[PDB]
Design a protein around this ligand. Sequence first.
Ligand SMILES: CC(=O)N[C@H]1/C(=N/OC(=O)Nc2ccccc2)O[C@H](CO)[C@@H](O)[C@@H]1O
Ligand SMILES: CC(=O)N[C@H]1/C(=N/OC(=O)Nc2ccccc2)O[C@H](CO)[C@@H](O)[C@@H]1O
Ligand SMILES: [Mg+2]
Ligand SMILES: [Mg+2]
Lengths: 617, 612
Amino acid sequence: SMASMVRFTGLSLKQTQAIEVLKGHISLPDVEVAVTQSDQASISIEGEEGHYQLTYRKPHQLYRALSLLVTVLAEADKVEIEEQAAYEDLAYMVDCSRNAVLNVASAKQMIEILALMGYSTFELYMEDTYQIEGQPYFGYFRGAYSAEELQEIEAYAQQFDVTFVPCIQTLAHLSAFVKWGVKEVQELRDVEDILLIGEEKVYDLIDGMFATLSKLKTRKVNIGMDEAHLVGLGRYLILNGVVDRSLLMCQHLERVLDIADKYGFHCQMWSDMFFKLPEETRVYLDRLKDRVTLVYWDYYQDSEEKYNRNFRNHHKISHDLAFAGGAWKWIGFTPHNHFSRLVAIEANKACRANQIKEVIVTGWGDNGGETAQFSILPSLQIWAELSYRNDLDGLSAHFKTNTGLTVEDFMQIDLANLLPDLPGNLSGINPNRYVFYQDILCPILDQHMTPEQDKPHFAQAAETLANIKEKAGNYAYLFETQAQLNAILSSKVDVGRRIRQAYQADDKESLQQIARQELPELRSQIEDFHALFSHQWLKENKVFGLDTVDIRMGGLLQRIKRAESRIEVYLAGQLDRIDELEVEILPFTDFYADKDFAATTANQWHTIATASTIYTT
Amino acid sequence: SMVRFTGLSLKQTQAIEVLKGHISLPDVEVAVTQSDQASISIEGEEGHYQLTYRKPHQLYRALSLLVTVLAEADKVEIEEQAAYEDLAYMVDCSRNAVLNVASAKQMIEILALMGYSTFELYMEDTYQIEGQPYFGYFRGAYSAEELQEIEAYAQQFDVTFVPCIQTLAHLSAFVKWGVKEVQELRDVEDILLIGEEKVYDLIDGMFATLSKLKTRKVNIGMDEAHLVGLGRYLILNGVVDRSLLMCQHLERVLDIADKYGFHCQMWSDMFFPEETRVYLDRLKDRVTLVYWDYYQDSEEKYNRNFRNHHKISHDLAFAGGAWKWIGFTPHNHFSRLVAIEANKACRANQIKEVIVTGWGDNGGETAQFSILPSLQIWAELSYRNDLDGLSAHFKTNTGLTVEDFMQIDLANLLPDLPGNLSGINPNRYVFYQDILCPILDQHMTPEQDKPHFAQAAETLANIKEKAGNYAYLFETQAQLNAILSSKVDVGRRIRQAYQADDKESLQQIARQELPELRSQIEDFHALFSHQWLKENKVFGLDTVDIRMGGLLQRIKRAESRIEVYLAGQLDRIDELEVEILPFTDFYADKDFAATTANQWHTIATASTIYTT
Ligand SMILES: CC(=O)N[C@H]1/C(=N/OC(=O)Nc2ccccc2)O[C@H](CO)[C@@H](O)[C@@H]1O
Ligand SMILES: CC(=O)N[C@H]1/C(=N/OC(=O)Nc2ccccc2)O[C@H](CO)[C@@H](O)[C@@H]1O
Ligand SMILES: [Mg+2]
Ligand SMILES: [Mg+2]
């Protein structure tokens, strides 16, 4: 609240205003800074004794430069900074399709942080969550962005010289749209989440998609096309018979590119359909690859060489390549910044070795968008540092300048996933989620729990996170949510197992303590978690989509009530056996069976919560 | 009773003692014998009667008839000639609701009284297979000992047992389990991988379990599975002819069945190039085909399909429907309408076996005993070719008139529906619809609907009081109709008060109406749970707890959003600014607003909930 007495020369009014916004995040000292554009480096800062010369190559690089300047002057008077960014473009892609649609205010906040970190580009992943005129079911009750909302977000990014790229889908992954049982929708379908290739009303829809996006200033779009096994194999196969499936994809892509051409767009797409690179089809693939940027996506590999093989294979067919890495926030309620760091380190090496020009960091939200949108800030800074510096020596300090938290403290956000016997190089291991949604009477994940280890882990995490929350400022909400989650998981990780132990030993006093004390308290804790979670959601996202979490959490609460009622019936002598408890628990999955830890990966709510049917007919 | 019989076996005498729990045999003397002269005949006067049956089970329908007639007359002249060699009821035990052993016995007793020869259970993954621990896991799958006990109890009444299973698709609850010993068995979706020996090893285990029974008749399934050959099959083997593929699979399954001595029935779909016609003609002669149809409102429409089937084969059975798969509330009325026309067509085509199906689509939420009227209707149509005796025999067997029992249907019986369109199910979608985002609101007609539901709740509460051991069925429905009377338009009422800035009315909804709604749904959940645990194993009720908990939490959200708005902490309730579109156009050109919506997950939310 003490106003900065910083003094700049060389700025545009655009830049002075941007800086005034960013004073809300960083603290500029009373120094004098001469600013100019120069080709010499991405960023350069020289000087001493309160007088500095700052240059940037691209305008948006001014903002990372200010973060670097703030940071270095806390340690020293004299500055000698020169960064050469490895990537011409560095982007962050938020998932707005998995129920969580980032609200406009939060998009602006994200854009400010991206600018401070060094990102050139902001992207939103929208399957059905943007409005198309004359398609009233596309996005219905999903909080689809209006054209105007998209223009406002894009315009706000432009205030920081950050570009906007919408990421859409032009063939498959349109499940929330295609479910609507009206002729105007069903006539567009092939099978599952896949649109019907060759159908003119499908190309009319796709023309409408580009109509909406042409209202923006950007002329860069990611059109999707990521793997779909059943393309050609549904209503298409009925209407048309067996076709060469790569030829079918080429036909469809050509139509999409012609539409995009009409509205002035250049298209990026996932590289999947070109992995095959029948001669005529080879030639057709080869011709279409020259009109797109291919995106090689990979969130998983633990060594540079594994990426290098794929880069080398991709470069045998196209130089117009981007790499998509991952900020892991798609595995329930809790991110995995730690894993993301591990793979970014190796991915960056390979990107550099292959002279890759563009990196997109993806922020997927699989299966309900339950992880906080701002949970992955450390992963974002990690990629910015690797691009601009090729090392992580400045990560913590820069991150603290930008956020108020050390990177180490922020990364404790991951804790509900960080069970102690896991090796750090395995992905998707997500007890945050499956421990939370598992049933009480029928704990189908119970073989994956290790209470001697897990209970104190979750209990200590709750305390750690509570301490970090006190010093997190405007990010405290993230840690408050996580602290309550960990508190819950500490008892819930084995309540199902302890019920079964008591029941088998005929320990009726313990059964009674569980049904009358522990379980009602667990409910009360989950209710408090629902409230913290809801606060988090509504801060970050539109209201739409929160409904699914209400349904899931309501159902869990009702199942805890059933455990209580079933145990009471039995304690009353009204039942000879509690049948649920006579079923022996098998492994939920063998995916990590080979390994010397019990945890696993389980990331579909509907199979975590019940072995019964719930969506099938 | 003190009724006195001559000519009975000890097996018969024991059976009749059990059935005295359901019917009141008056003090009269009855000579019994088997005779080929009629399915049932009963003659006599003034306290002495002669009863004959053709097939041993028909003794028990005969006794129901005798009880009924003697109530309005001394002298009896009955002769029935049943149209069907076999008349079966197939209970769905795969949709989460597994009929418990005690209820299977009660059902068997009723079916015996009605005149059914056969009892069937539809079991996708809900029987135990040695060495296949995930098949049925946490589903309440029947042990071989349970299935033996059920079959053995039916045999006491000379009722036969026919397992209905799946040997290719519709195994979704099994194939979900992410372990190698299950995923190696899959093609795609709910479909097993044809050609894979480990799949034939499973199928053998299926028949190994079922061979523990006395019966050697089985329905092996094979009802349409659109994507067979198109998943891992296509990836492993490329494009193959898909009908020839079905042939290779069907032969393996029949050879397996032969190993164990079974004669197979199957749904007829796969029968609607020369190497393929040859293959089909040879398999078709090995199996009985079942033409299933639950929908047509005229004899002609059935006859057209019977003529089509008769082009392929004459070893044909018909499967009709007792409508209990459309949520919480059955549709005995529609079932009656279609059974009249289907029975005309069956007779007109010399069809010998009729199977009445009791499916429980999308969670098994309709009571197992909700469709007794549909069952009696088909029995009456086989044995008499009319419904003159329906009500009085139904009252003898259950203690209720058929008209009183058929009030169970009321939450579906909106007044402007024609009688002849199926699947119209407001009982379910009015219940599970959201409050803030009422996506089915265009289908609601509150001027008509509110008083319909409100009146139904009163009618059902009166029937409950005279329903004896079936009272639970009517109590459940009374509570449901009570809820629906207010919930049918609560979402629309919120939107009207919001548009009008009627804050008094929003505050009343939030603080009195919605919490009372929650209370009533809690009460319905308790009645439902009593009903469920009476009829079914406990497994599968969890899905209902999840669905109902979720609805209650969403009602709490309606309350909290309105309270935040009322406190000035919000400028707009965004949910309420969305305009409601029709949910589906399936019935749009018609003269009613109701529709069909029978998937919980799309009733309750427009958001994603099972997809990644
Ligand atoms: C391009 C992309 O990432 N597509 C999907 C996507 N696809 O990922 C995989 O299919 N990963 C994978 C598949 C097989 C084996 C190992 C990893 O991953 C994201 C995170 O789960 C999903 O949100 C995206 O929808
Ligand atoms: C043999 C059978 O009845 N198969 C399914 C079944 N199939 O029915 C239809 O597919 N009906 C239908 C399909 C297309 C058009 C009109 C009716 O109906 C039952 C009740 O809904 C389901 O429970 C069964 O799993
Ligand atoms: Mg209970
Ligand atoms: Mg006969």
